[PDB]
Amino acid sequence: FQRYQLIMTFHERPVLPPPLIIFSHMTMIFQHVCRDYGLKLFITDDELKKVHDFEEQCIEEYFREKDD
């Protein structure tokens, strides 16, 4: 279960390690005046329709198998 939290907290972390992370901290201040993957996955309407059809097929198959 905690593998997910480990992966997320290392995905959100900066690149440089703490010995030289002070460079990455200054860039955040400089960018202060101004998720394709790793968290989510954005898909079009055709892919959404195919996913919905697959899920309906899976749930009806599950109920049929349970009854049988």
Add this chain to the structure above:
Amino acid sequence: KSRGKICTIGIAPWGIVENQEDLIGRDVVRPYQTMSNPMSKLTVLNSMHSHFILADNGTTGKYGAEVKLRRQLEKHISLQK
């Protein structure tokens, strides 16, 4: 109760469907209602059919526009190898 699909094909005249509208959308999903109105003088499209072939002779409210086409299609598919 069982898996699998049955290729049921309906060849119905276009003039007897309860909603000539709500189906004009070309290559797009169109919702359809199975509710039957006895005073509408028409009939609803039967569900649980895999495909439909709606044949029209230009009239509305009368049959006879699909028997010859259905027989010709049966003759042509019978000769198929």
